[PDB]
Enzyme design. Structure first.
Site, PDB file in Angstrom:
ATOM      1  N   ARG A  40       4.315 -13.424   0.489  1.00  0.00           N
ATOM      2  CA  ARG A  40       4.106 -12.101   1.027  1.00  0.00           C
ATOM      3  C   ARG A  40       3.393 -11.269  -0.028  1.00  0.00           C
ATOM      4  O   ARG A  40       3.935 -11.083  -1.112  1.00  0.00           O
ATOM      5  CB  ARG A  40       5.466 -11.479   1.353  1.00  0.00           C
ATOM      6  CG  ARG A  40       5.293  -9.982   1.567  1.00  0.00           C
ATOM      7  CD  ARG A  40       6.367  -9.362   2.380  1.00  0.00           C
ATOM      8  NE  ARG A  40       6.474 -10.057   3.661  1.00  0.00           N
ATOM      9  CZ  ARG A  40       5.887  -9.675   4.765  1.00  0.00           C
ATOM     10  NH1 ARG A  40       4.950  -8.752   4.736  1.00  0.00           N
ATOM     11  NH2 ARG A  40       6.211 -10.250   5.901  1.00  0.00           N
ATOM     12  N   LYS A  99       9.211  -3.404  17.500  1.00  0.00           N
ATOM     13  CA  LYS A  99       9.219  -4.109  16.229  1.00  0.00           C
ATOM     14  C   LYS A  99       8.435  -3.395  15.112  1.00  0.00           C
ATOM     15  O   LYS A  99       8.823  -3.512  13.948  1.00  0.00           O
ATOM     16  CB  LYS A  99       8.718  -5.544  16.423  1.00  0.00           C
ATOM     17  CG  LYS A  99       8.945  -6.424  15.194  1.00  0.00           C
ATOM     18  CD  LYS A  99       8.373  -7.832  15.231  1.00  0.00           C
ATOM     19  CE  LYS A  99       8.321  -8.343  13.821  1.00  0.00           C
ATOM     20  NZ  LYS A  99       7.924  -9.745  13.773  1.00  0.00           N
ATOM     21  N   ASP A 107      11.111 -16.592   9.627  1.00  0.00           N
ATOM     22  CA  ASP A 107       9.856 -17.246   9.985  1.00  0.00           C
ATOM     23  C   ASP A 107       9.525 -18.384   9.022  1.00  0.00           C
ATOM     24  O   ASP A 107       8.482 -18.994   9.147  1.00  0.00           O
ATOM     25  CB  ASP A 107       8.638 -16.346   9.879  1.00  0.00           C
ATOM     26  CG  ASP A 107       8.693 -15.044  10.638  1.00  0.00           C
ATOM     27  OD1 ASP A 107       9.580 -14.906  11.511  1.00  0.00           O
ATOM     28  OD2 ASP A 107       7.872 -14.171  10.303  1.00  0.00           O
ATOM     29  N   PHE A 121      13.693  -4.282   3.587  1.00  0.00           N
ATOM     30  CA  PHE A 121      14.797  -4.903   4.290  1.00  0.00           C
ATOM     31  C   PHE A 121      14.244  -5.784   5.413  1.00  0.00           C
ATOM     32  O   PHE A 121      14.558  -6.975   5.486  1.00  0.00           O
ATOM     33  CB  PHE A 121      15.773  -3.803   4.744  1.00  0.00           C
ATOM     34  CG  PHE A 121      16.667  -4.127   5.934  1.00  0.00           C
ATOM     35  CD1 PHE A 121      17.622  -5.129   5.867  1.00  0.00           C
ATOM     36  CD2 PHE A 121      16.543  -3.432   7.131  1.00  0.00           C
ATOM     37  CE1 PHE A 121      18.421  -5.419   6.966  1.00  0.00           C
ATOM     38  CE2 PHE A 121      17.351  -3.725   8.213  1.00  0.00           C
ATOM     39  CZ  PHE A 121      18.279  -4.723   8.136  1.00  0.00           C
ATOM     40  N   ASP A 127      12.716 -11.049   7.600  1.00  0.00           N
ATOM     41  CA  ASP A 127      11.746 -11.652   8.510  1.00  0.00           C
ATOM     42  C   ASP A 127      11.119 -12.893   7.900  1.00  0.00           C
ATOM     43  O   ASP A 127      10.849 -13.843   8.622  1.00  0.00           O
ATOM     44  CB  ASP A 127      10.643 -10.695   8.927  1.00  0.00           C
ATOM     45  CG  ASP A 127      11.112  -9.671   9.944  1.00  0.00           C
ATOM     46  OD1 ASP A 127      12.231  -9.858  10.452  1.00  0.00           O
ATOM     47  OD2 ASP A 127      10.390  -8.682  10.183  1.00  0.00           O
ATOM     48  N   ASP A 153      -4.882  -5.280  13.864  1.00  0.00           N
ATOM     49  CA  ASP A 153      -4.515  -6.260  12.848  1.00  0.00           C
ATOM     50  C   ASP A 153      -4.648  -7.675  13.400  1.00  0.00           C
ATOM     51  O   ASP A 153      -5.063  -8.582  12.674  1.00  0.00           O
ATOM     52  CB  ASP A 153      -3.116  -6.048  12.286  1.00  0.00           C
ATOM     53  CG  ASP A 153      -2.959  -4.813  11.409  1.00  0.00           C
ATOM     54  OD1 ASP A 153      -3.973  -4.104  11.181  1.00  0.00           O
ATOM     55  OD2 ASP A 153      -1.822  -4.553  10.970  1.00  0.00           O
ATOM     56  N   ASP A 154      -4.307  -7.849  14.679  1.00  0.00           N
ATOM     57  CA  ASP A 154      -4.388  -9.162  15.305  1.00  0.00           C
ATOM     58  C   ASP A 154      -5.847  -9.622  15.338  1.00  0.00           C
ATOM     59  O   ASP A 154      -6.165 -10.766  14.994  1.00  0.00           O
ATOM     60  CB  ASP A 154      -3.747  -9.156  16.685  1.00  0.00           C
ATOM     61  CG  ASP A 154      -2.225  -9.100  16.717  1.00  0.00           C
ATOM     62  OD1 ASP A 154      -1.602  -9.188  15.624  1.00  0.00           O
ATOM     63  OD2 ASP A 154      -1.686  -8.974  17.840  1.00  0.00           O
ATOM     64  N   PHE A 195      -2.981  -0.020  16.177  1.00  0.00           N
ATOM     65  CA  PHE A 195      -3.224  -0.554  14.840  1.00  0.00           C
ATOM     66  C   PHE A 195      -2.733  -2.003  14.708  1.00  0.00           C
ATOM     67  O   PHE A 195      -3.302  -2.775  13.946  1.00  0.00           O
ATOM     68  CB  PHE A 195      -2.691   0.370  13.744  1.00  0.00           C
ATOM     69  CG  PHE A 195      -3.564   1.611  13.525  1.00  0.00           C
ATOM     70  CD1 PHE A 195      -4.863   1.503  13.031  1.00  0.00           C
ATOM     71  CD2 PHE A 195      -3.081   2.899  13.783  1.00  0.00           C
ATOM     72  CE1 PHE A 195      -5.647   2.638  12.809  1.00  0.00           C
ATOM     73  CE2 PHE A 195      -3.868   4.022  13.563  1.00  0.00           C
ATOM     74  CZ  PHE A 195      -5.146   3.888  13.070  1.00  0.00           C
ATOM     75  N   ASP A 209      10.563 -10.763  19.760  1.00  0.00           N
ATOM     76  CA  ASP A 209       9.611 -11.658  19.130  1.00  0.00           C
ATOM     77  C   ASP A 209      10.210 -13.064  19.078  1.00  0.00           C
ATOM     78  O   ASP A 209       9.587 -14.008  19.553  1.00  0.00           O
ATOM     79  CB  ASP A 209       9.170 -11.140  17.774  1.00  0.00           C
ATOM     80  CG  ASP A 209       7.767 -11.532  17.327  1.00  0.00           C
ATOM     81  OD1 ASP A 209       6.927 -11.871  18.204  1.00  0.00           O
ATOM     82  OD2 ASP A 209       7.524 -11.497  16.097  1.00  0.00           O
ATOM     83  N   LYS A 219       0.822  -1.201   0.000  1.00  0.00           N
ATOM     84  CA  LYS A 219       0.000   0.000   0.000  1.00  0.00           C
ATOM     85  C   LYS A 219       0.867   1.266   0.000  1.00  0.00           C
ATOM     86  O   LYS A 219       0.395   2.305  -0.443  1.00  0.00           O
ATOM     87  CB  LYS A 219      -0.968  -0.019   1.192  1.00  0.00           C
ATOM     88  CG  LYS A 219      -2.041  -1.109   1.186  1.00  0.00           C
ATOM     89  CD  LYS A 219      -3.223  -0.853   2.126  1.00  0.00           C
TER      90      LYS A 219
HETATM   91  O1  LIG Z   1     -16.176   0.794  12.361  1.00  0.00           O
HETATM   92  P1  LIG Z   1     -15.994  -0.183  13.500  1.00  0.00           P
HETATM   93  O2  LIG Z   1     -16.974  -1.315  13.403  1.00  0.00           O
HETATM   94  O3  LIG Z   1     -14.589  -0.716  13.569  1.00  0.00           O
HETATM   95  C1  LIG Z   1     -16.420   0.746  15.057  1.00  0.00           C
HETATM   96  N1  LIG Z   1     -15.312   1.458  15.709  1.00  0.00           N
HETATM   97  C2  LIG Z   1     -14.926   2.788  15.597  1.00  0.00           C
HETATM   98  C3  LIG Z   1     -15.757   3.846  15.222  1.00  0.00           C
HETATM   99  N2  LIG Z   1     -15.317   5.115  15.135  1.00  0.00           N
HETATM  100  C4  LIG Z   1     -14.032   5.356  15.446  1.00  0.00           C
HETATM  101  C5  LIG Z   1     -13.130   4.375  15.850  1.00  0.00           C
HETATM  102  C6  LIG Z   1     -11.703   4.616  16.181  1.00  0.00           C
HETATM  103  C7  LIG Z   1     -10.890   5.363  15.336  1.00  0.00           C
HETATM  104  C8  LIG Z   1      -9.529   5.493  15.562  1.00  0.00           C
HETATM  105  C9  LIG Z   1      -8.939   4.798  16.608  1.00  0.00           C
HETATM  106  O4  LIG Z   1      -7.602   4.859  16.900  1.00  0.00           O
HETATM  107  C10 LIG Z   1      -6.730   5.613  16.085  1.00  0.00           C
HETATM  108  C11 LIG Z   1      -6.382   6.973  16.585  1.00  0.00           C
HETATM  109  C12 LIG Z   1      -5.384   5.875  16.651  1.00  0.00           C
HETATM  110  C13 LIG Z   1      -9.716   3.995  17.421  1.00  0.00           C
HETATM  111  C14 LIG Z   1     -11.068   3.864  17.160  1.00  0.00           C
HETATM  112  C15 LIG Z   1     -13.622   3.085  15.973  1.00  0.00           C
HETATM  113  P2  LIG Z   1     -16.947  -0.368  16.398  1.00  0.00           P
HETATM  114  O5  LIG Z   1     -15.986  -1.525  16.294  1.00  0.00           O
HETATM  115  O6  LIG Z   1     -16.774   0.398  17.695  1.00  0.00           O
HETATM  116  O7  LIG Z   1     -18.382  -0.790  16.158  1.00  0.00           O
END
Ligand SMILES: O=P(O)(O)C(Nc1cncc(-c2ccc(OC3CC3)cc2)c1)P(=O)(O)O
Ligand SMILES: O=P(O)(O)C(Nc1cncc(-c2ccc(OC3CC3)cc2)c1)P(=O)(O)O
Lengths: 338, 338
Positions: A102, A189, A97, A88, A93, A232-233, A228, A164, A47
């Site tokens: 990828r 990491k 692993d 890199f 990695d 992802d997890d 984030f 890790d 991306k």
């Molecule tokens: O759209 P989602 O279904 O994922 C909803 N979540 C949602 C809605 N509006 C804003 C967020 C939000 C955005 C950014 C976030 O973190 C980044 C600033 C670092 C965390 C949560 C999260 P929910 O899971 O609560 O139903």
């Protein structure tokens, strides 16, 4: 779309990155051809979010009258340096692993006639960063600051990789999968090079070189990076592949946020089920794991974590963004959110 | 003995190198312990010639009144940086070549519970260089010059490694073993980091930063480096293990000076014997190869090469040493000669 606007000229610049890195010394031609192949295979196809952040931040941090042609060449270049840093790490990695693919392509090291030569190829990708920085930025006041930032970023990521590897010997023991250890791995990491690095590079290029400013940006961005990866997890299991790739964390014996929280909240007889099922190739076992997470209300725990997190990040951006424009953080947040 | 005099305090300084590189951030302790193990296993046990050259050159290039305690700490440190560069290359090279031992010890990657994690360990060793340079030299006028020199040295060595790997796919073809290609490999893969780097680091620390001066030193040292690798190739076969390790170049299918010269000087029916014998595990075959070299008077060709070489180097030192003291070159020459 602030990202979607920059993307065209970013990816187009790649052609030039490659030209200059293969541009005198005829005896090494064959090695340079190999270098060309390594770049095209490994630096292209993602991306480009990390690279693009450099360019987007640069646009938001510099007076529009001081965004001459040269300045933009340099911002694209440092963005491509971030992407080369990532290539890199990922090439290496994937070897460590024993990964197969990828980005739905065969990993570089798995290509026939590559194998463990990929170790040197990874190292060349790291080399290329400092080649580019010299070629485009040696005369600039921020040159040394960028060199040190890239080097610091490699070191941080490598330390994180060490944690890790100590945490999940490929011989995994769940006793090692703790939250404090989970947070450290993510921080060292992924968070530093993914979230702090690109903004920092942009800060330095705009003359913002103060320790306190950097400390403030880093406080925000490290917490963004934590959120984030945890996101992802979760998506790895509870996502849809269209929304996300396909999830394999469980059969892979990963120290994933999910497993970590599972361990915190379990009666003694649930460890001795997860022991039984976590990390097995068979799919009836992988379903037992998912079903256990579901029974432990881990979506709810995630949701609660997502809320606390959004609030805290917004608070941090309120406090510590200044004197940077808050849209620098907010944009990245919006862009990475999947 | 100019080397034998410095050696005591050099190796003693290692203890301090390790202290400072593991010296705040409690969450990463386990990774730092791993780092300690990687340093002790990989950076210790060689002759330390490259590191020591930094210190010896420093002593010969600085007015003895400007060799204060701090200056010597820094010279030891940069010397240890050279040794860490070498550890990085050798740990990784041992993986790529599927080597068993190094210095009569099991290669790091072959130690149980290490394996391909050694790739990250190698990378950490490279990281440690720039950590040390920052900790000891950030305030010095030569700081940036050293950073760039170490980075340039990594890049050169990596390019050289690429050529080696292209030249002998582990699938070897003798058509690729040419003199022009032999010289390039040695130059990029060993000569730059082994001969140019240590003297250059010393030059910079003594305020000698001119392009022409560096070009002159490099001209001498690259040719020294060429001679000494060719000397190592010869000794590999025609040496005695007491004089030298035990030689394995032939069974290993190496692009060695010997094989290269063999190919230059052969009737069509001698390629089709060497084809037959070069690179075979069996020992009756390895003896056929030696006996062919012997029949081709390759000692004589070496001897003739050794003479031309000594003459040319002395001539270069006469011309291009100034304004450096000629003993800087001459000493290294005497010390490496085996
Ligand atoms: O759209 P989602 O279904 O994922 C909803 N979540 C949602 C809605 N509006 C804003 C967020 C939000 C955005 C950014 C976030 O973190 C980044 C600033 C670092 C965390 C949560 C999260 P929910 O899971 O609560 O139903
Ligand atoms: O002691 P050796 O048996 O190896 C004798 N060689 C010898 C004697 N004296 C000086 C040299 C010499 C020293 C340095 C050289 O190159 C270094 C400056 C780069 C090359 C040759 C080589 P030879 O093989 O000729 O009987």
């Amino acid at each position: 779309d602030v990202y979607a606007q920059e993307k065209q000229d970013f990816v187009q610049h790649f052609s030039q990155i490659v030209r200059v890195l293969t541009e005198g010394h005829p005896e090494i031609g064959d090695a340079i051809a190999r270098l060309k192949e390594v770049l095209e295979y490994n630096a292209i196809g993602g991306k480009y979010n990390r690279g693009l952040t450099v360019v987007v931040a640069f646009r938001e941090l510099v007076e529009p009258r001081k965004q001459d042609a040269d300045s933009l060449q340099r911002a694209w270049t440092v963005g491509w340096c971030v992407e080369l840093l990532q290539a890199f790490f990922l090439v290496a990695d994937d070897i460590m692993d024993s990964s197969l693919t990828r980005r739905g392509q065969i990993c570089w090291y798995q290509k026939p006639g590559v194998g463990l030569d990929a170790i040197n190829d990874a190292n060349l990708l790291e080399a290329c960063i400092y080649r580019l920085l010299k070629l485009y930025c040696r005369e600039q006041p921020y040159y040394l600051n960028l060199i040190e930032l890239f080097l610091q970023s490699s070191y941080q990521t490598e330390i994180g990789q060490t944690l890790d590897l100590l945490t999940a010997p490929q011989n995994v023991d769940l006793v090692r999968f703790t939250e404090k250890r989970y947070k450290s791995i993510v921080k060292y990491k992924t968070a530093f090079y993914s979230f702090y690095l690109p903004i920092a590079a942009a800060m330095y290029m705009a003359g913002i070189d103060g320790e306190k400013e950097h400390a403030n940006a880093k406080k925000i961005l490290l917490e963004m990076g934590e959120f984030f990866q945890i996101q992802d997890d979760y998506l790895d299991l509870f996502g849809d592949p269209s929304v996300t790739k396909i999830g394999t964390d469980i059969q892979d014996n990963k120290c994933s946020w999910l497993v970590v929280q599972c361990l915190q909240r379990a009666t003694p007889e649930q460890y001795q089920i997860l022991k039984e099922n976590y990390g097995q190739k068979e799919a009836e076992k992988v379903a037992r794991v998912k079903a256990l997470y579901e029974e432990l209300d881990l979506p709810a725990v995630f949701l609660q974590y997502e809320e606390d997190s959004y609030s805290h990040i917004m608070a941090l951006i309120e406090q510590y963004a200044a004197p940077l424009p808050p849209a620098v953080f907010l944009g990245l947040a919006r862009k990475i959110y999947k």
